[PDB]
């Protein structure tokens, strides 16, 4: 025994071929999932549930692997999804085909590093080219935004609900802008809560100008319907609490016991009139609520809700503009819940809910998803996540790119020109990258079901013409279509991060040349 006693090793071209095979398989298991013609994939989770979704990221996230490079690709997919939402419908496919053409230069005995340098030059030129072929677009103009969203979503199940989806996403994203950064305000996608409630139909789902609380009134008396409520956020518990410093009491005289019993009652009262001094209407807390304080608030005709999740508290506060408070004696009218157009408690069926709508200028909002069943609802919300993500990306960058593979073909002939002007050994890898790019439109074609070779040739030949870069591939017709009238547009940053992570995947995998197992630590 020398090295580690049951740690395997493998070396060289075998390792490179194995990793390339793994990457190719990873790409392959998803190649059918892309495109407006896309398939619909469903998963068997380890612990019983059912998950069905087109989105590649979730598909891969429900994959465990043994070969490592596959795990690397998995993480790559999850990163791209996190950053941009979609493109993962394409990113891993592009990376896999990139690698597949890449390996062809290994048996050329072409050492990897020079190919890597070629890839880096390729990425630089691709970024430049895409920036040259963008289109800036207004952000205020609503219907163009809706068109963008429809374009980015007409690949998953929500397509037939495109109008509702686009309106939902636009409404949600537009009204989430924390202007406190001067003119550099940032939107956030953790206040845009998504709630899945079964029953009803997709058409019933709508944007609620407020928050959803899956709780109920603590006592019968509090009114379940209020026009202009005032809201107080009590982060602290509203009841008598442990003396944190392990206090103790040693009474001697009879009255003392009943007196201390009265004292906690009195403290509860103190908190109660401290609250009511501000003339509130609504009491919210993440902690519990004493039934005695509940009594006093009832006597003041004040609605109280108990034990709500902290994130939910934050969202409510952002909804009615008030700020959370943990000290009733330190309560300030500046945190009065002004800005709640209506307080209500309905029944969805066997369960109460809390509606706080019609805020003056709500900055927080949750979306009410009402469909058929929790798994389809989860698919819907994943699609909504992707849509609202790309919408926010647009609100960060007003630059757009013609998708449908059109940009890909533009990049293709651009790199072809650079290559034929760029003599050297690295030339062949460069044009190899160019050719590898061509497969996104290809996959579009097969998922459509048309003559892939002739269609692709017509596309490429069409795109040698300088006068037009907007020629792309229609999802359903399977015919060459200029993208402008078709209107499938995408945010620039999407496709940027797409290629960028792709070539990173390429370099990271191509540098690998050996395997070692069994670390046991």
């Amino acid at each position: 025994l020398v090295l580690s006693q049951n740690t395997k090793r493998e070396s060289g071209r075998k390792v490179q071929s194995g990793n390339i095979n793994a990457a190719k398989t990873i790409a392959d298991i998803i190649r059918t999932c892309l495109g407006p013609k896309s398939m619909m994939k469903m998963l068997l989770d380890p612990m019983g549930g059912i998950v069905m979704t087109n989105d590649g990221n979730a598909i891969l996230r429900e994959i465990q692997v043994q070969h490592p490079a596959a795990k690397s690709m998995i993480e790559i997919s999850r990163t791209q999804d996190e950053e941009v939402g979609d493109g993962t419908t394409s990113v891993i496919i592009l990376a896999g085909e990139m690698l597949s053409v890449a390996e062809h230069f290994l048996e050329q005995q072409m050492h990897p590093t020079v190919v890597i340098s070629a890839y880096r030059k390729a990425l630089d030129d691709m970024i430049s080219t895409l920036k040259k072929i963008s289109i800036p677009v207004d952000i205020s103009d609503s219907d163009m935004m809706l068109n963008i969203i429809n374009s980015s979503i007409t690949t998953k199940a929500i397509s037939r609900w495109s109008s509702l989806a686009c309106n939902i996403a636009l409404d949600a994203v537009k009204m989430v802008q924390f202007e406190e950064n001067g003119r550099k305000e940032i939107d956030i996608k953790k206040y845009a809560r998504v709630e899945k409630i079964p029953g009803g139909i997709i058409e019933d789902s709508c944007v609620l100008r407020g928050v959803m609380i899956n709780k109920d009134v603590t006592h019968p008396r509090m009114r379940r319907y209020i026009k202009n409520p005032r809201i107080v956020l009590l982060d602290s518990s509203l009841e008598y609490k442990k003396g944190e410093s392990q206090t103790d009491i040693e009474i001697t005289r009879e009255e003392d016991f009943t007196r201390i019993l009265q004292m906690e009652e009195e403290y509860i009262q103190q908190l109660c009139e401290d609250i009511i001094q501000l003339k509130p209407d609504v009491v919210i807390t993440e902690k519990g609520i004493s039934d005695l304080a509940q009594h006093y608030l009832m006597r003041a005709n004040i609605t109280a809700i108990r034990r709500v999740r902290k994130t939910d508290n934050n969202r409510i506060a952002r909804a009615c503009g008030a700020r959370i408070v943990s000290r009733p004696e330190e309560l300030r009218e500046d945190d009065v819940g002004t800005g709640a157009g209506l307080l209500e408690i309905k029944k969805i069926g066997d369960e109460y809910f809390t509606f706080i709508t019609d805020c003056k200028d709500p900055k927080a909002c949750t979306i009410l998803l009402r469909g058929a069943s929790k798994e389809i609802l989860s698919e819907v919300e994943r699609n909504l996540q992707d849509a609202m993500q790309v919408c926010r990306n647009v609100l960060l960058d007003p630059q757009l790119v013609p998708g449908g593979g059109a940009s890909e073909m533009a990049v293709a002939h651009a790199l072809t020109e650079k290559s034929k002007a760029m003599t050297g050994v690295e030339q062949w890898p460069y044009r190899a990258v160019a050719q590898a790019l061509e497969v996104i439109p290809r996959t579009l074609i097969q998922n459509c079901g048309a003559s892939t070779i002739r269609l692709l040739t017509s596309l490429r030949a069409k795109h040698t013409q300088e006068n037009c870069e907007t020629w792309g591939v229609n999802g359903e017709t399977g015919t060459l279509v200029d993208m402008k009238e078709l209107g499938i547009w995408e945010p620039l940053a999407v496709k940027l991060q797409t290629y960028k992570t792709a070539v990173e995947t390429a370099v990271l995998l191509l540098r690998i040349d050996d395997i070692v197992s069994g670390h046991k630590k």
Binding site: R120, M263, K500
Partner: protein
Amino acid sequence: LSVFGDRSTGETIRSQNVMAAASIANIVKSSLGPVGLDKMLVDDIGDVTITNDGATILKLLEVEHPAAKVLCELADLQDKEVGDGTTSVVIIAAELLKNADELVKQKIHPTSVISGYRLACKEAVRYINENLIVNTDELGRDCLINAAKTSMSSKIIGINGDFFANMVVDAVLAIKYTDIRGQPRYPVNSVNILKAHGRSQMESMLISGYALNCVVGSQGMPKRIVNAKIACLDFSLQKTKMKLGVQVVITDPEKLDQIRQRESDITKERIQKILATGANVILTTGGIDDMCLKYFVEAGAMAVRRVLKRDLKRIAKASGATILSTLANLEGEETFEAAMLGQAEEVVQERICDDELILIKNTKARTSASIILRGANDFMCDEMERSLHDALCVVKRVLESKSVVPGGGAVEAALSIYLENYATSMGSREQLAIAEFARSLLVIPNTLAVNAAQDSTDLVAKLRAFHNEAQVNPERKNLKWIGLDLSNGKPRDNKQAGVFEPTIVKVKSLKFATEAAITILRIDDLIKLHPE
């Protein structure tokens, strides 16, 4: 006659040790030089770790044979001292051991070999100090970029080497530090490195300041402050305990309420004393309670909890704030002074990869440098941060010792022939050890070529020929040169090419390799003990 294990002696154990050393060498033989190809480890459970830096590999690789553990520890030490050369030093040690044994494998008495090795190391370091190149005349940023990007190849980032070297040199010059009163020492690891998967390293950004891997404690509390009011506080923020044993006993119930009242009012007044100073930013390794959070929101200040101690110490050094374990004074009363405050132009939490991290820009007291990495996966990001840490290490060496060495193996290129000539001087048997030292040390070009996959013998011969010519016709100002390359598979002048390495790398490398050879070669028997 020992229970629970046998023993091995002489030739068997010698060959075994060489065998293990060669094994360890071949483990990393493929990860050195501007064409080095990185390693990666399926751990046991999928948490893989791509890396080409040898010391990392050795540490993460379990080892059982003794001599191999010796080599692993040597690699770890080298990393603790240089940062690269774990690319090289392990190979050097193994090759020297191999040839030394090959001498011993015949008969040759080991201690003679050891003495020859000692002489070889001393001669070699002296000749290097006669082979030194000084950067003081050379342009600072120029040679810094050169050394950086030289280290940057054989790594994931060598392609972006130019950009990365620019960033690294900017950071290191921005982390200047006045030492013992006579030294401009530059602290490695002072620059902060944060990994963030997502965009490419193309978009990886240098921070003219310091960066925090923390978040805003209270969502209602603001996000950006254009003012520099930054206070540090080790002292945690809770409604205080009695903190040792102090039981509270009540014989008059009338006061329990007021007791509880101050149980929080103590923290309240502490906070109010802090804020009345006007500090708008507070940091705390200790806990932060919601009681304090709401007060801060009502004040609109900045609060961060559970920050690592090193980070806040760096904050104090940058902003000029004072680390405060508590509030106190030369007099007993707990007060707080604005003089304790540190400054920085603007402090922002920003969302990178849907995770909010806290930035501190342009502390006026002392310029700080932090670097953010952007990449595809966590694997590439953390391996590149290892790379960058090595980069900062080597640049620190360059600045600390105004002295540079031509890279690409010119070192042993010269050393082999120079020691070859010097060998005949001794006249003993030890010149045989000297010659074997030289020939073994000639391994670096061999590995370079094989990893570059061309005729290695021919490149090595051409190198030796050029250097031997550099040892004829002592008018060598037009006959002394230096260089070797791989990308074109033919020699060059690395001095012109910019391929440079810091001197301390090769110096300490050869010294430690010599020590390792001395240790392992003196072995002649292992005795095993099966455990209790």
